[PDB]
């Protein structure tokens, strides 16, 4: 996430902070609800943080803890992982590894858990969905991405060798070569409680959210944010992707949900006003969609087009192909509800127009 880069809400006030600014600090734990730990991990990037869980939990007999999500390899947060080890876990051992999705900040240390940290102390089963699984194998094993790029209107030879010269691996420097498949409404039990899988898409493959009905608690993952909104982005691999309708509808699961219902964001600060956040997540792409609208009804855009009004501030080009995705998605939303008109022009690059 060094290059990536996202909206702040400026409606934060509208939400709940049952903490305040109460934070863990590293290699320390905060109770946030009974049997429910929050643990906050370093990151080197803009988001400078990633929140993990640890949950009380019994299986076989075995009193012990269930993880969910696990960090980047980054050695500070293995250290503050043994500290943990050493000093925050009561003595007893992690039972398992829950991963919400494939992306770095979550799986990275996925298979360094699973296997003991440094000691080896215990050898223990990811549980995880199966597209963020496989995605994540795929990707833990480019000059498409600048092919891509270049047909959506980035044409400085420059800026295309950066990124034809190009992550994931040292972050996700292993994948377990097992995993327990996690599917959308199965009941886990975990400690005193149920907590039913919610899977969400368009941020991607199929992430899991866990949802504690009967104590109203949820793992939100990366798909509710307070402060930030979700990456939601068109890439080389799915050219014709429609990730922005799959997310705005993916909201839709929380929206059922209890409105007084804690949410425990990957990033940001545990909150209530689940509601109300979703509701300042769909304006913010309303938003956007008309900006797009806009711009489309005057000139046929492409998505390097659409960045600069889209973003207001200066991108560095590794930022701009971030961008650039996230433009994409909101042209290929209109685009294939039939409000735009996809266009390759003859310098080969792909244009949108009313
Ligand atoms: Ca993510
Ligand atoms: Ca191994
Ligand atoms: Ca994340």
Same mark, same amino acid.
């Given at each position: 996430?060094?290059?990536?880069?996202?909206?702040?809400?400026?409606?934060?006030?509208?939400?709940?902070?049952? *903490?305040?600014?109460?934070?863990?600090?590293?290699?320390?734990?905060?109770?946030? #609800?009974?049997?429910?730990?929050?643990?906050?991990?370093?990151?080197?990037?803009?988001?400078?943080?990633?929140?993990?869980?640890?949950?009380?939990?019994?299986?076989?007999?075995? =009193?012990?803890?269930?993880?969910?999500?696990?960090?980047?390899?980054?050695?500070?947060? =293995? #250290?503050?992982?043994?500290?943990?080890?050493?000093?925050?876990?009561?003595?007893?051992?992690?039972?398992?590894?829950?991963?919400?999705?494939?992306?770095?900040?979550?799986?990275?240390?996925?298979?360094?858990?699973?296997?003991?940290?440094?000691?080896?102390?215990?050898?223990?089963?990811?549980?995880?969905?199966?597209?963020?699984?496989?995605?994540?194998?795929?990707?833990?094993?480019?000059?498409?991405?600048?092919?891509? *790029?270049?047909?959506?209107?980035?044409?400085?030879?420059?800026?295309?060798? =950066?990124?034809?010269?190009?992550?994931?691996?040292?972050?996700?420097?292993?994948?377990?070569?097992?995993?327990?498949?996690?599917?959308?409404?199965?009941?886990?039990?975990?400690?005193?409680?149920?907590?039913?899988?919610?899977?969400? *898409?368009?941020?991607?493959?199929?992430?899991?959210?866990?949802?504690?009905?009967?104590?109203?608690?949820?793992?939100?993952?990366?798909?509710?944010?307070?402060?930030?909104?979700?990456?939601?982005?068109? *890439?080389?691999?799915?050219?014709?992707?429609?990730?922005?309708?799959?997310?705005?509808?993916?909201?839709?699961?929380?929206?059922?949900?209890?409105?007084?219902?804690?949410?425990?964001?990957?990033?940001? =600060?545990?909150?209530?006003?689940?509601?109300?956040?979703?509701?300042?997540?769909?304006?913010?792409? #309303?938003?956007?969609?008309?900006?797009?609208?806009?711009?489309?009804?005057?000139?046929?855009?492409?998505?390097?087009?659409?960045?600069?009004?889209?973003?207001?501030?200066?991108?560095?080009?590794?930022?701009?192909?971030?961008?650039?995705?996230?433009?994409?998605?909101?042209?290929?939303?209109?685009?294939?509800?039939?409000?735009?008109?996809?266009?390759?022009?003859?310098?080969?690059?792909?244009?949108?127009?009313?």
């Amino acid at each position: 996430a060094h290059h990536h880069h996202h909206h702040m809400n400026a409606l934060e006030h509208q939400l709940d902070y049952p *903490f305040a600014d109460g934070m863990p600090a590293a290699g320390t734990t905060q109770e946030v #609800a009974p049997g429910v730990y929050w643990l906050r991990m370093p990151l080197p990037f803009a988001l400078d943080h990633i929140n993990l869980w640890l949950l009380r939990d019994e299986i076989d007999g075995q =009193k012990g803890w269930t993880i969910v999500d696990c960090g980047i390899a980054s050695g500070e947060i =293995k #250290a503050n992982w043994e500290t943990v080890f050493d000093t925050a876990l009561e003595g007893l051992p992690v039972l398992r590894v829950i991963v919400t999705h494939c992306h770095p900040d979550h799986l990275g240390l996925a298979n360094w858990l699973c296997e003991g940290g440094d000691k080896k102390r215990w050898n223990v089963r990811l549980w995880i969905t199966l597209g963020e699984y496989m995605l994540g194998r795929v990707m833990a094993a480019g000059e498409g991405a600048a092919r891509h *790029f270049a047909r959506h209107g980035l044409r400085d030879e420059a800026s295309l060798d =950066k990124l034809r010269n190009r992550y994931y691996a040292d972050l996700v420097p292993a994948v377990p070569g097992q995993y327990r498949r996690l599917r959308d409404g199965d009941a886990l039990s975990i400690g005193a409680r149920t907590w039913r899988v919610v899977t969400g *898409f368009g941020h991607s493959p199929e992430h899991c959210a866990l949802h504690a009905e009967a104590d109203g608690v949820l793992i939100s993952g990366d798909m509710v944010l307070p402060r930030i909104s979700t990456n939601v982005s068109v *890439f080389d691999i799915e050219p014709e992707g429609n990730p922005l309708a799959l997310y705005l509808e993916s909201l839709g699961r929380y929206e059922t949900m209890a409105a007084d219902t804690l949410v425990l964001p990957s990033h940001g =600060k545990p909150f209530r006003g689940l509601h109300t956040r979703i509701g300042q997540l769909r304006d913010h792409h #309303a938003a956007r969609l008309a900006e797009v609208r806009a711009a489309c009804a005057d000139k046929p855009c492409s998505a390097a087009d659409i960045v600069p009004i889209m973003f207001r501030r200066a991108l560095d080009i590794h930022q701009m192909t971030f961008a650039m995705g996230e433009a994409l998605a909101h042209l290929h939303l209109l685009w294939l509800q039939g409000e735009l008109t996809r266009v390759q022009g003859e310098d080969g690059v792909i244009r949108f127009r009313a």
